[PDB]
Amino acid sequence: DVRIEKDFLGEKEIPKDAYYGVQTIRATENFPITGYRIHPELIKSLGIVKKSAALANMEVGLLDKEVGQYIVKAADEVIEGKWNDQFIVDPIQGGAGTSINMNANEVIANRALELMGEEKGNYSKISPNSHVNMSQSTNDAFPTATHIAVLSLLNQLIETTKYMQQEFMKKADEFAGVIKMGRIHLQDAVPILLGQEFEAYARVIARDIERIANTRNNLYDINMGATAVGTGLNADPEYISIVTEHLAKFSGHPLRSAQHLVDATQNTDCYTEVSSALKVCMINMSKIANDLRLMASGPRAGLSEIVLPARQPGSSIIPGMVCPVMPEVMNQVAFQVFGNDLTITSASEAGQFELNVMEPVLFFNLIQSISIMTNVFKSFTENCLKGIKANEERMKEYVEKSIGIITAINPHVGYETASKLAREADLTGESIRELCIKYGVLTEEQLNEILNPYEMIHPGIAG
Amino acid sequence: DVRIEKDFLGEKEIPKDAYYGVQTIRATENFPITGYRIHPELIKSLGIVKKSAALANMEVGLLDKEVGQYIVKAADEVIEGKWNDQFIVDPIQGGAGTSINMNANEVIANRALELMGEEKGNYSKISPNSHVNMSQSTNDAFPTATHIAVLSLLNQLIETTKYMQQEFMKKADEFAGVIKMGRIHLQDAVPILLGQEFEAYARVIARDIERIANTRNNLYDINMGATAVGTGLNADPEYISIVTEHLAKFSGHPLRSAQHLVDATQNTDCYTEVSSALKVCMINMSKIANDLRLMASGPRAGLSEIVLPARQPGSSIIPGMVCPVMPEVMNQVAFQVFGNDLTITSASEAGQFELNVMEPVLFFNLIQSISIMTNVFKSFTENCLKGIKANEERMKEYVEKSIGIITAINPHVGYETASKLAREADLTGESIRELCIKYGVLTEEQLNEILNPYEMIHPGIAG
Amino acid sequence: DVRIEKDFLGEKEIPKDAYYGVQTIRATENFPITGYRIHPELIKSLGIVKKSAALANMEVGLLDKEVGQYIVKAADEVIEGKWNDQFIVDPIQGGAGTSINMNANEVIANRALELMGEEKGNYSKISPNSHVNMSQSTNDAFPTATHIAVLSLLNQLIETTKYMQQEFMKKADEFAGVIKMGRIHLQDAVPILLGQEFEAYARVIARDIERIANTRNNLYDINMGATAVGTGLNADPEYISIVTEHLAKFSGHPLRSAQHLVDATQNTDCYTEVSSALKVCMINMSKIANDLRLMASGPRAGLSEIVLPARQPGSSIIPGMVCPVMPEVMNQVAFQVFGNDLTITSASEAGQFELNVMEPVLFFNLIQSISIMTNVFKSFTENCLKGIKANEERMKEYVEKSIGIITAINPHVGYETASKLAREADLTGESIRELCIKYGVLTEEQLNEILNPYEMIHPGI
Amino acid sequence: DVRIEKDFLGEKEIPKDAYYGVQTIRATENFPITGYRIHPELIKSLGIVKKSAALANMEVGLLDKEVGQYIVKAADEVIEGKWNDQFIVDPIQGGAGTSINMNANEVIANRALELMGEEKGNYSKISPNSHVNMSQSTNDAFPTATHIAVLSLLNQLIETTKYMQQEFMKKADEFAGVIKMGRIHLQDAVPILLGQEFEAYARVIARDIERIANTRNNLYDINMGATAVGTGLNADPEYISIVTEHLAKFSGHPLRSAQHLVDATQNTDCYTEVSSALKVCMINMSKIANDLRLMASGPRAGLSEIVLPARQPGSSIIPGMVCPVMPEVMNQVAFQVFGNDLTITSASEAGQFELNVMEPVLFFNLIQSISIMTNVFKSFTENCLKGIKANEERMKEYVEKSIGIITAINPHVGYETASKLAREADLTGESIRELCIKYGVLTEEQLNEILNPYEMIHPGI
Ligand code: NA
Ligand code: NA
């Protein structure tokens, strides 16, 4: 039922059908923290790293082509997502990612052994350390795999967010004629188009796409060849060049060998720069969600400017309640990303000399942020945003009854007079138009032009 | 293979062997955010809530005793942890916890139906809403279950942390004779006992236990009977009294019916008060961990004051490296709790009028904090703290070679003279004792008493 | 125009009329960061510390009675707030607070010298280090002073908060009969009294008062006598017991000498505990302020449930605009405190071995939090909360025309009739009450009982 | 001693000699929160805004040429920093910045009145609202001024940072030959040059310069002309084009009128983008400062790899102590910025519909971050970084007696001999180099090449 493996600390039993090994099992004893598994994209990227390294090591004559070809086939299986269940270590873990790198090394070595008809655990023939980890350290393989995983996930977030942004733009278009009252401080102000607010939403999101896209650039620099500390001592420059080109080609990213491997091994600014752009994006999305929730308030004692698609019963006790559950989950995902960014800040700040050992919790958080933003943006776009409808009559009635349309008469008649009219209209509950007429401030004809609400929506002195 | 269920929004297919229902499946479409499951303690507590309610509702004559007895048996199964797999909704979810409450209501209703020989889905006989949720709202059942789960988890953290605190105290005792140099600003200062530092660690942790224990008090107030908004309109006061006593008795906590149900339904300060005490605790533990990592630095170009149990190979490329992986994972768990507390802050701040809809992400975070602190504290206590050893010779050599022992001569001979001696000793690399003798500041006899390092470890003018 | 002073590092020019000295001037070159000054209460508390130490050192025969007496009189002037302008060092400073301790030691020494007719700078007669700092370290004097300052500031915050909490409870009373629509998810639910919301506000604030008051307890333990690292090297144990008693008696706080001075010198959890309770309080206050600003929304396209006292013009372009400026500044002070608390967290976490050197920024933020909360609570209470008025008729009208008011009538009339009444109410203009009367379902007298605000908003039928 | 002024809300007494007015005095009663004043660069930028608007309004025939000319001269005095003392409102204030805009409008109006020989307060002749605020809102004037202030402050930070970055690169050069032990997890690893660490420092700082410089781009889009909500109601489109050009030309920044003024009036992402780049920079700087403080640990029980310039006595009780005060204040400024960034995050998130009213606290924090970073970078560069010295012999000695130096010799000597050499080195006192010589394994000349600092620290064999 079990086999026995060993490292410099001793021996352990492994289930015979497991592809992980001794260093993996030790990580499960050392760090039973969350019970989560690493993201499958990171597993995939680990497999891209070990395939790339095995090819490069063979090409430069360091690795036996017999063993190397099986390492490559096993790594391809990992890349295709065939072995996600064998990656059992905790995302939150001591040892700076060694246990993640070793989980990859062990799984690939053991699967390679099985593919050449050998016994799993026979590290004499295929060693996790000496073959699958050849020319590598934790301190290059783990971050390089993370750069690749983060880049692949960012590319998916970007595509999802461009889709959402475009759906905001379609709503802006659908609502381009819908007039309502703009509010500042939650006080009635002057008229605005609902489509102008939705375009404001589309535009901030366009700016977020650009910020997030631009954070990829610093992740294209990888540190493969760094060895233990970034000096690259005893790394072969031809190994570095060739592994880099394989990593680029198999991952699909324009990866580059960092110009200064010590810089690239010990600094973590590439990661906080990403987390920062994700946070900024979710600030904007939370604000947008808060607006949607206010606009959907009601149905009788709220603003009731829009109707969201109903997505689930709101209450078992208020008959027929529907709640804005999709904006609410967007807010919650924002609050989660805000927190993840503080965990990332604190972990990046904790780096010491040649290595930041806090990267596992940094990378867990950063991947989680990207992943939950992708998922909530997809679900919000499909289950809410596309289906939003406007209560046009209600919003028109707000404009029809406002005081603040009176703003438009300031350049003609003065803020002082308009204020007197505004105060009176507010205290009597009369229409501001009627008051202008009854006091001879303006004629019916000239305030038909001046108090045109649609015309006040683009710049100019009315008239 | 499937059955069909319905709510006021429409019909859905459910796998025939599933105990969840239509509202559950809708939550899985609305919120595919994390893919996590709610903590099993919360599942258990939901079952305590629905059992308690069913008993109270029968006792006051609202619920049929035939259906009620099966609801109770099903809820007991949930309480014992037999149905954790049927709780499939995302911890991060819109609808303020409705989908969590409905997952409980559905699972219990359906299991109850199966126990009385009926068809799952036959809500005519046993309704998730009308029977299992009777006299309840999301807005009391969900927070009440959370109070119970948080209290049970806090009690386990407290016990784990008292164990850790006691193991720190044992190390303080083991090291009570071990002399070393105290450092301020990382500059050599005056002698201290290693056992005094470990007692400083034990004492802050004692203070953390007290803070965390004291946060339970505000969670003992529950809001069962609140109905939709806290008014309790149409709740039966005898139902409230009786359900409270069952909740207390089955959960083991001294629960109390809040004095003002509107306050208790809309305020979330009980939760941030807990998160705050957890954060403070992890600030202290991170600092302690950082100290341990500095003391274990080396082995030749570091401080090398202590040796930690080796827990995994440190490197595949530095021969025989061992890294302080257990302190490192403690730091990472701190950074995670710091972030979780910011998510909790932001979610509590977002409450509006009669309900804080952001509670799902608040409660996910708070439970995660308590849970990961418990797990890392257990693992750190067993896999590191108990086994720590002191390099007594090294630390003694620091004291033997220090400048700063010279502090003790200030009251005798003046800070001005001691400074001259200190500077000289620092620039020549001579022993400060020899300099005192050679310049006739003190006799060999009087500085044998005065520069006794052990005596400078407790208050007094040396002499 | 200058004198020359000297420390371990060499000599510096000091303005002839200055009471600070060489170690102070160096700090002003090293840390020109914010341009702020330390809080006057911290200056005061430093004066309490140096007075207390001078008395204890004299009593134990370590300090000259005559020189000690002048140190004490100079310290008393500092305590009374006469020399705040001589405390020039930046609150954000390296050195772990040495520069603040030295600013006190120098000002006091020099003023003491002036009081005995000597020249400022004559450290031969009265030394900042040897006399004013005798038996002490930065690492006990500076924290002890901070514990005392923070305690004093907390006591004032608590009194201000208790005043605000009581004014919320008066508004709860004023509004005890005012009915409105409760909202969950911002969706119309069932009726609630405005007074119940204000009471929920007052109750959370009561809980905050308790949390904050309870953070004082760990600050009453001081480390005076710890000297450099908590070992108490060069502090006589009788000096420690005497200085502690003077610190308690002059400060008015029940200070205690910590049970383990090494613990109390290196751990900073008393400070994060305080910051935490301040953050939690401001979370609740921010939420309350958010609710107020929603209730004040309008005048015609908003909820318009309450009217806040007008405090300033809202706009120089929109005629008639007035804005909820006092809830808004409450929000902003919350966001400030949240941030201050993260700075405090990060500084506390950065402690190393025997000393946390990041205390200056930690204490600057903590004292800032306490201070801005006191000031905004006072201003918000006097300029907004006391004057809040309810639009009772508006709120009643929406309750009368809601769906949710059906909930009060359901057990009386049964679900079948309730549904028919609800349907009619949707399609006609009419309130459920009027319809109950029109169709003889309930009598006007029975509806007066059933839809009584208190009765629709409490448990029972 | 007083005059009387009046707004929409009524009349107030103003000190006769004050240039501020009624809306300003009300703000000083409403918000006595911090006691701070807005940054002088924001005052300056407000003056640029009001000058620019007065010129555009005149050009378009909306404002009297004569009154406009006095408004402009008064604005120019504000721009030159002559009236900073008249800006008394608190940076933390409700009203979304109205009180800051009004403080500018009032000071300028009153000074303009004094320049034409009129009485301060005579708003009949020159109105804060009607003339100085003409064609504007708080909601365009205040942000536009902030964009300009922040841009100016960023440009100074960038220049200061570039100076610091270059001084790190000079130290990398000075230390290019200095070998020491690289450490991972604080465990001894393999040799590294001190110069490579300093170059890693310089390179991250280069990346920070780039991030921060790139945040300017979104600030060049301004919303002047948006008026209340971005619709531009009451702003003539030719006024918008002319005021934008004046704003660019007087400020020296390439300002552009935002493409959608409603977007630019309600969204605050340009500000969080800036705060984010500042936070990221200070994360890196804090880490660097942590490393410096570890390298400076000692003198006898620490690493003692570097010596920092001494800047102040470390202790008045421990003789001889000097502390790394300049890295320490760098840490503390980082923690400050981290917190400021959370305040900024929370304020930005709190935007509602057409306006984010939490901008005053957001801008106070953002400007504070930029300002304290500039000041600490300058002071740290001049008072520490330039003067850092290496303990080269100490560092070399530990490299020579390490295990890790074996790594350079392994491919030359093969694993079997390397292990024998390592074992011997552990048990005897002797360095691997000496042992290589003693046992004829390698020649002294071959060891000079192999263990050359540059050669053991770069890829290859
Ligand atoms: Na988190
Ligand atoms: Na701050």
Residue numbers in the entry:
A (entry chain B), B (entry chain B): 4 to 466
C (entry chain A), D (entry chain A): 4 to 464
Sentences from the paper on this structure:
Aspartate ammonia lyases catalyze the reversible amination of fumarate to l-aspartate. Furthermore, a conserved flexible loop, named SS-loop, that contains a two serine signature sequence plays an important role in substrate binding and catalysis. One of the serines acts as a general base in the deamination reaction by abstracting a proton from the Cβ atom of the substrate, forming an enolate anion intermediate. For this, the SS-loop changes from an open conformation in the absence of substrate to a closed conformation that covers the active site in the presence of substrate.
b The variant of AspB carrying the AspB-A1 pocket (T187I+M321I+K324M+N326C) and the loop mutations A422S+Y429D were used further and relabeled AspB-6x. To rationalize the effect of mutations that allowed for β-alanine synthesis, crystal structures of variants AspB-6x and CcAsp-6x were determined to 1.9 and 3.1 Å resolution, respectively. Both variants were crystallized in an apo state: cocrystallization and crystal soaking experiments with acrylic acid, ammonia, or β-alanine did not yield a structure with a bound ligand. While the wild-type AspB crystal structure contains both open and closed SS-loops, unliganded AspB-6x and CcAsp-6x adopted the typical closed conformation observed previously only in the liganded active sites of wild-type AspB. In AspB-6x, the introduced Ile321 interacts with Val193, while Met324 makes hydrophobic contacts with Ala192, Gln190, and the mutated Ile187. Additional hydrophobic contacts are formed between Cys326 and Val328. Thus, the mutations that remove the charged binding pocket for the α-carboxylate group of aspartate may also have a stabilizing effect on the closed SS-loop conformation. In contrast, the activity-enhancing A422S and Y429D mutations that were designed to promote the closed conformation of the SS-loop in AspB-6x are positioned in helix α16 of the small C-terminal domain of an adjacent subunit. In the crystal structure of wild-type AspB, the open conformation of the SS-loop at unliganded active sites is stabilized via hydrophobic interactions with C-terminal domain residues Ile406, Tyr418, Ala421, Ala422, Ala425, and Tyr429.17 Mutations A422S and Y429D disrupt this hydrophobic cluster and thus will destabilize the open-loop conformation and shift the equilibrium toward the closed-loop conformation.
